[PDB]
Paper text:
With etoposide and moxifloxacin, we solved 2.80 and 2.95 Å DNA-cleavage complex structures in a P21 unit cell with two complexes in the asymmetric unit. The primary interaction of fluoroquinolones with the protein is via a water–metal ion bridge to two conserved residues on GyrA (Ser84 and Glu88 in S. aureus GyrA); these two residues are the most commonly mutated in clinical isolates resistant to fluoroquinolones. The four cleavage complexes (two QPT-1 and two moxifloxacin complexes) not in the CRsym or Casym clusters have a range of configurations (angles between two subunits at DNA gate of 177.5–178.9°) intermediate between those of the two clusters. Furthermore, these intermediate complexes have buried areas between those observed for the CRsym and Casym clusters (1,203–1,526 Å2, purple structures in Supplementary Fig. 7). In contrast, S. aureus gyrase complexes with two QPT-1 or two moxifloxacins molecules bound can have relatively large areas buried between the two subunits at the DNA gate (1,203–1,526 Å2 in Fig. 6g), suggesting that with two QPT-1 or moxifloxacin molecules the DNA gate can close more completely (more stably) than with two etoposides bound (this might be because etoposide is less flat and keeps the −1 and +1 bases further apart). Furthermore, our study reveals the binding pocket of QPT-1 overlays with moxifloxacin affording opportunities for scaffold hopping.
Bacteria have two well-conserved topo2As, DNA gyrase and topoisomerase IV (topo IV), which allow for dual targeting by antibacterials, affording reduced spontaneous resistance.
Author numbering:
A (entry chain D): 414 to 545, 580 to 637
B (entry chain C), C (entry chain A): 10 to 490
D (entry chain B): 415 to 545, 580 to 639
The structure:
DNA sequence: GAGCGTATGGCCATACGCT
DNA sequence: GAGCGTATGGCCATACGCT
C-alpha cells in the first residue's frame, strides 16, 4: 500500500466507492482523510496512457491501466461484466487545473473504449474540488475530507452517455492519431 | 448533478490544449520565449541577479520563480534554466552558469543544490527598458504579484536562439540564427517594407547553429523561409586524413545541432557490431576541453574512407535533418509564420517598445520640469517662501499659503516643503538652473521623436546597430553550395 | 607530495567529528537550536514570513536558507523545517505549516513543491530584539551574508521543545517540557541562585510531551535532573471499556513520545498472528482529527483485559523508555548538563540579551537627543542658519560654518542641512520639543536599568512572566506517583 | 552513468583512477579528465565503515563491490598487486568536513582489505581548491586545471610508516568503542 | 532486535507533434 | 523509428550513538 491502492473494508459494492486521485501527495492525504470502511483510494501517478493512440499489446502492458482493471475486477472489452464490479461509484479526482482536465480526458478515453457499460450504468463520477489555483497536493488532510471525501458536503458529477455515435466521433477526433482534425477543432472552437 | 460525457470531453480537452498552446509549449513572436523562460529571466531581473553581481545558488532562483510566478515543478524550472546556460543549446546563451551544466554527450546538469547562475550580458538587452512602461504587466497565478506579458527584447531573440516545443494539435521548430545577420535583415526591412524573402536572404543566409557544422544547400532554407516549413540537412564536419601505408581515418570535429554525441557514437558502434557497416577497425571519442569535439573513425587498408563516411551520413545521426515548423504566438494566438512575418512582428514590437519608452520618459521629464519651475520660483523669492512657511501653523496651511501667494501648484508647493536646507547652498541653486535647461532640450528631443515616425524608426535602427556591434559574432555553420 | 596514513586519519576524522558536534547534531544551550533550525527561523524572519502575513511556498524558504546560510541538501533543510511544524514532534511548534506535514503513523510530509509555511507566534519570541545588538552576528559560509550565532530566545526553548541528535563520540536526548513550569523554575532560580534540583522540581515536575500520555514514577526524572542522564518510563493512555454483555475493549488514546503508531500497531498484530499474545479478537486504528489517537483492541470473552494490557506494555512500544542524555553546546563546546545548569545558562543568556538591548536602546536615544538638540538650536536661530547656508558656496563650507558659528557637531550640522522646509511650521517646531523631553525621560529610565543589576534582573522576570501568561499551557503528560 | 568510466589505455603504469565524491562531481570529472590515462569511479553517499561491519555486509555493499571490480586486485588474502588496473588510485572528495569523513572511510577499507595497495604507494589524495564550495559546484575546465592535470595538480601519496600505530589508529577512530573516540575528540579539541 | 534525526540525488513512465 | 522539450516525485543505502 505505499504507492499502490488502499481498499475499503466493506465487501458489498453498493456501499463502497473508489477514488482515482491525481498524484502521490494527493494519494497520501486522501488515504488519511477517508472513511476506510466505504472509501478506497487508487493513486494515479503521472499522465495516464492515451488508449486511443495505443495498440492493445501496449495498453495491457501498462501498469497504470492494469492497476485499475484489477481494482474494479470487471474485465475489459468483450469480457466486461457490469455485475462483476467491486465498486458502485468510480470517482475521478483530479487537480482543478488544465493538466487535471487532461488526466480526466485520458481516463474517460480508457473507460469509453474498454469499460463502456460502467459509464452507461452511471458508476463513473467526477469529484468537484475547490477551483482556486492550489490543486489536490497543496490541500490538508481535513480540508481534503470536508471538500470532496464527505458524500454529504461533496458534489459529484455523474458521467452520462447521450449519443454514442457522436461520442465515438468525439473520442476519435480529440484523442486519435490524426493531428489535422484536432488542429481544426482547436482552430474552430478556440 | 449530472454531466454529459461528450461535453466534458470537448470542454476539458479544449481547456488543456489551449493552455499548452498559449501558456506552455509555444514561444511569443515578440520576445521568443515560453512562459517558463520569461519567468526565469524576470525572476533573475527582480532579484538583481545581473552579470556585475556574484553567482546566486540555482535552488534560490528556482524557488523564487516557482513561489512568485511559475506554479509547477522545481525540476521543470531548473531544467528550462539549465538549457539557457548551455553554449551548445542556446546560440546566444541567456543564463550564465557556474558548475556542472551538462555537456553534448547527453550528460545532465548537477542537481540545483550544486550549481549557481546569474543573467548573461545579452539578457540585459531582453530586459532593457522593462520598467519604462514599454511592456504590459499582468497579475500572477495567485494575484499577490505582477509579471511581464512579454519582455522588451531589444534583439530578435525568437530567430537568434530559435524555439522547439510540442503543443496539442501543433508543434514548433525554429532554428537558431546569427545576430549580425538578423539585425542586418531587420535594418533592411525597416528601410524597405516590400522586401522579398530572397532579398532578406542576402543578410540572413540561413540558420546558424551553436554546434556549428554544415548545411547542405540553400534549397531547404529557402522553402523554410518562404512558407515557415522546410527540411534543412545538417551534416557533421568530417575530414579524411591520408596516412602512411595507404591507410586512412575520419575525424569528426563538429556534429549536428541537438544531436547527442554519445548516442551518435553508440549508433556507429552498434552498426559495426551488427555488421550493418563494413570497413571500421576502431572508433574513439578523443574529445577534450583543449580540442573540442574529436570523434576518430579508423578505416581498414583495403577499404575506401569516402564510401564509409557517406554511408555513415545516411545510416547514423552524423547527418540529421532539421524539420522547420515556424509556429509562434502572434496576438496571443498560434500562427505558422514565414521569415519576413517573424521579422515584421519583431520590428513592430521594437517600434512600440521605443515609442512607449519615449512617451514614459516625456511624462516624467514634463513632471520634473514642472517641479524645477516651482523650486526656481522658491529660490528666487526664498526670504518670502521661508516667512510664509514659518507663519503657517500646519503643513496644510503652508501648502495653501504657498499656492495662493506664489501662484504655485499643489505638486510645486509640496516639492518646496520637501526641499532640504542644503539645496540653498551656492552650487545647489546653480544645479537646479542647469537641470531645468538640459531638461527643456531633452523634452524637445523626445517631442521630435513622437512627432516624426521616421525619427522614431531611425532611433530603433541606431539602437539595433549598437546591439549588433556589441554582441554580433562570426557565422558558425557553413552553408555549402 | 607525501602524507602519513595515521596523520591523515587523525586530522580528517577530528575535522568531521568536531564539525558534527559544534555545527550539526548538537543544540546550543542558550536557544536550544541546531544550526539548520536556527537558519530556517532566521531565514523566515529576514524574508518577513511572520504569522500576520500569508503562507509562503516551502521551496522558496528552503532555497533561500540554502543559498544564504545552509550549504547542504534541500531535503535535509525541508525535513528539519517539517518537524518544527509537527504538533506531535514539537511541544511548542516553531513553524506554521499548510498541507501534508506528515502524521504520527510515520508517513512523511508532501514534497516541498506542495507545501507552504510561515513562523508561529511563539517563534517571534525566539527572534524578539534580534536587531537590537542583543546577539552576535557572524559571516556565512561564502562571506556574502551575515547570520546569528544564537537567537535571543525570550523563552527557554532547549527545555521547552527538547532536543535529539546523534553526533560523533556523543549524542543528546533532552525531553520536552511545560513552558509554565519552566518559566516558573527560571523565576525561582533568579530569586534564589543556590536553589536545589529538588526545590526546582516543585516548579518543573518533569518532561511534558506533545503526545501527552503518562510517566511512571518521579525516580527516573530525579536522576535525569541531578546528573543529566536517566531513563524515564513512558506509558500509553489506555482504558478498558465495558461494551457487551460480557465483552470488553481496550482503547489507546495517547501513545508514547517519538513512538511510531503504525509500527506499534504492526508489533501488536505480529504477536497476535504468532500467538505470543492470546485474547485479542480484533485490532483497529480508529484515529481521526476530531477523534485524535484511537487504537481499539477488542478482548475475547472470559479473557482478562487487565492481563492483556499489562502484557502489551511489556511486549510492545505501548510502554517505551526515554533515555535522557542532556548534552548541549555551552561556550561552543559539548557538555553534559543537569537541570539547574540548563536553567542557569539560559538565565545568563536572558540577562545578556536584556542588558545588550537596553545598552543599544540607550546609544540610539542619546544619538537622537543629540540631533534634536541640534535641530532645537537651528529652529531657535533659523534666520541666521538660513543666512549661513545661503552664504556658503558648497555643502562642505555650510557644514564648517554651521559648526564654527553655532557650536554644533558634524552630525548636528549634517542633520540641519538635511532638514526639510516643512519642519519650520508651527506644529512641527512643537513636535521636536515634545520628542526631546520624552526622550530625556526614556534615557533616565534606561540608565536606571543599567545602574542597578536587580532592576535589570526584575525586567527579565517581568518579560518572562509576560511570555508565560501568553503562551504557557496546561500539562499534557500525567506523572503517576 | 553512475558506474565506472574507464580510460582507453591498457598499461596500468600510466593509468589513474579518480574515486569522485557524488554523482554531480562525477559527471564534470568525466568531462574534464584525460580520456587516455584517467578513469572516474563516482562514489555515492557515505562509504560503509568496514571496521564496524561484518564480511557478509562488506561484500554485499555495492559501492565497495564497484571499487574491487575496478581495481581487479581482490580482497584480503587473495589481493594481488600484479593484477592492479591503475598504479594511481586517487581519493577525490569535497574540500569540506564530510569530504574528510568519506576520505577516512575509504582509507579504512583500503587498510583492512587492500593493505599492499597503500604500501606500494598506489593510494593518493587529490588536493582541490579549498574555496568553501564543493566538487559539484565546480566547472569541468577548473576541475582539470587544479585537481586532475599532472602539470598543476598536487596529490598526497598515502604512506605507511608504523603498522602497529596505524592498527591502533583505525581501531580507535573507526571502531565500535565510542569512549576512545570521544577521548580523542576531547584531547585533540581545537585543532 | 532497531530506529531516532541531520548529513552524503539519479531512475523510472506518461501526453503532445513531427520526421 | 525514437527523441526532441515543458508538463504530471518516491525509492534506495550509508555514518553516527544510544538504549
Ligand atoms: C545517491 O545517494 C543516495 C542514496 N543512494 C545510496 C545508495 C548508493 C548507490 C546508489 N543507490 C543507493 C541509494 C539514497 F538511498 C538516498 C539519498 C538521499 O536521501 C539524499 C538526500 O539528499 O536526502 C542524497 N543522496 C545522495 C547524496 C548521497 C542519496
Ligand atoms: C512519480 O511520477 C513520475 C514518474 N513515474 C511515472 C511512473 C508511474 C508510477 C511510478 N513509476 C513511474 C515513474 C517518472 F518517471 C518521472 C517523474 C518526473 O520526472 C517528475 C518531475 O517533476 O520531474 C514528476 N513525476 C511525478 C509528478 C508525476 C514523475
Ligand atoms: C534494549 O535496547 C536495545 C533495543 N531496543 C529495545 C527498545 C524497543 C523498541 C525499539 N527499540 C528500543 C531499543 C534494540 F532494538 C537493539 C539493541 C541492540 O542492538 C544493542 C547492541 O549492542 O547492538 C543494544 N541494545 C541496548 C541494550 C543495550 C539494544
Ligand atoms: Mg496541478
Ligand atoms: Mg522529471
Ligand atoms: Mg542521417
Ligand atoms: Mg534523503
Ligand atoms: Mg515496552
Ligand atoms: Mg560537500
Ligand atoms: Mg545490536
Amino acid at each position: 500500500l505505499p504507492g499502490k491502492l488502499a481498499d475499503c473494508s466493506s465487501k458489498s459494492p453498493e456501499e463502497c466507492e473508489i477514488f482515482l486521485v491525481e498524484g502521490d501527495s494527493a494519494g497520501g492525504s486522501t488515504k488519511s482523510g477517508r472513511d476506510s470502511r466505504t472509501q478506497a483510494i487508487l493513486p494515479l501517478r503521472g499522465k495516464i496512457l492515451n488508449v486511443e493512440k495505443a495498440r492493445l499489446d501496449r495498453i495491457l502492458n501498462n501498469n497504470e491501466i492494469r492497476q485499475m482493471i484489477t481494482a474494479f475486477g470487471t474485465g475489459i472489452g468483450g469480457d466486461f461484466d457490469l455485475a462483476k464490479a467491486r465498486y458502485h461509484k468510480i470517482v475521478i479526482m483530479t487537480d482543478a487545473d488544465v493538466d487535471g482536465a487532461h488526466i480526466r480526458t485520458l481516463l474517460l478515453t480508457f473507460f469509453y473504449r474498454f469499460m463502456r457499460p460502467l459509464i452507461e450504468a452511471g458508476y463513473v463520477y467526477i469529484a468537484q474540488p475547490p477551483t482556486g489555483y492550489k490543486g489536490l497536493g497543496e490541500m490538508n488532510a481535513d480540508q481534503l475530507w470536508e471538500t470532496t471525501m464527505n458524500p454529504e458536503h461533496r458534489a459529484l458529477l455523474q458521467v452520462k452517455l447521450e449519443d454514442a455515435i457522436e461520442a465515438d466521433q468525439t473520442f476519435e477526433m480529440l484523442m486519435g492519431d490524426v493531428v489535422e482534425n484536432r488542429r481544426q477543432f482547436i482552430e474552430d472552437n478556440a | 448533478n449530472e454531466r454529459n460525457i461528450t461535453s466534458e470531453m470537448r470542454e476539458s480537452f479544449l481547456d488543456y490544449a489551449m493552455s499548452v498552446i498559449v501558456a506552455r509549449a509555444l514561444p511569443d513572436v515578440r520576445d521568443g520565449l515560453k512562459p517558463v523562460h520569461r519567468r526565469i529571466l524576470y525572476g533573475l531581473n527582480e532579484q538583481g541577479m545581473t552579470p556585475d553581481k556574484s553567482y546566486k545558488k540555482s535552488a534560490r532562483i528556482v524557488g523564487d520563480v516557482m513561489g512568485k510566478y511559475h506554479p509547477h515543478g522545481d525540476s521543470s524550472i531548473y531544467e528550462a534554466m539549465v538549457r539557457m546556460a548551455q553554449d551548445f543549446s542556446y546560440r546566444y546563451p541567456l543564463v550564465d552558469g557556474q558548475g556542472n551544466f551538462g555537456s553534448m554527450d547527453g550528460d545532465g546538469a548537477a542537481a540545483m543544490r550544486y550549481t549557481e547562475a546569474r543573467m548573461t550580458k545579452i539578457t540585459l538587452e531582453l530586459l532593457r527598458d522593462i520598467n519604462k512602461d514599454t511592456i504590459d504587466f499582468i497579475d500572477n497565478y495567485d494575484g499577490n504579484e505582477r509579471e511581464p506579458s512579454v519582455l522588451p527584447a531589444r534583439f530578435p531573440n525568437l530567430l537568434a536562439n530559435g524555439a522547439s516545443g510540442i503543443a496539442v494539435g501543433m508543434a514548433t521548430n525554429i532554428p537558431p540564427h546569427n545576430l549580425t545577420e538578423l539585425i542586418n535583415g531587420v535594418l533592411s526591412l525597416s528601410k524597405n517594407p516590400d522586401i522579398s524573402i530572397a532579398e532578406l536572404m542576402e543578410d540572413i543566409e540561413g540558420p546558424d547553429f551553436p554546434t556549428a557544422g554544415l548545411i547542405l544547400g540553400k534549397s531547404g532554407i529557402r522553402r523554410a523561409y518562404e512558407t515557415g516549413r522546410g527540411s534543412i540537412q545538417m551534416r557533421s564536419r568530417a575530414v579524411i586524413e591520408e596516412r602512411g601505408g595507404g591507410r586512412q581515418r575520419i575525424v569528426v570535429t563538429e556534429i549536428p545541432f541537438q544531436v547527442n554525441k554519445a548516442r551518435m557514437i553508440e549508433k556507429i558502434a552498434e552498426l559495426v557490431r551488427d555488421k550493418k557497416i563494413d570497413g571500421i577497425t576502431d572508433l574513439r571519442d578523443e574529445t577534450s576541453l583543449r580540442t573540442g569535439v574529436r570523434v576518430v573513425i579508423d578505416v581498414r587498408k583495403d577499404a575506401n574512407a569516402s564510401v564509409i563516411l557517406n554511408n555513415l551520413y545516411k545510416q547514423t545521426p552524423l547527418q540529421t535533418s532539421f524539420g522547420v515548423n515556424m509556429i509562434a504566438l502572434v496576438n496571443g494566438r498560434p500562427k505558422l509564420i514565414n521569415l519576413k512575418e517573424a521579422l515584421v512582428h519583431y520590428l513592430e514590437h521594437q517600434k512600440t517598445v521605443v515609442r512607449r519608452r519615449t512617451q514614459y520618459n516625456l511624462r516624467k521629464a514634463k513632471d520634473r520640469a514642472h517641479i524645477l519651475e516651482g523650486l526656481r520660483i522658491a529660490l528666487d523669492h526664498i526670504d518670502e517662501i521661508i516667512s510664509t512657511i514659518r507663519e503657517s501653523d500646519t503643513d496644510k496651511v503652508a501648502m495653501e499659503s504657498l499656492q495662493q501667494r506664489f501662484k504655485l501648484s499643489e505638486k510645486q508647493a509640496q516639492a518646496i516643503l520637501d526641499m532640504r536646507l542644503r539645496r540653498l547652498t551656492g552650487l545647489e541653486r546653480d544645479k537646479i538652473e542647469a537641470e531645468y535647461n538640459e531638461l527643456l532640450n531633452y523634452i524637445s528631443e523626445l517631442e521630435t521623436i513622437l512627432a516624426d515616425e521616421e525619427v522614431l524608426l531611425q532611433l530603433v535602427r541606431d539602437e539595433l546597430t549598437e546591439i549588433r556591434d556589441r554582441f554580433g559574432d562570426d557565422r558558425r555553420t557553413e552553408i555549402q553550395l
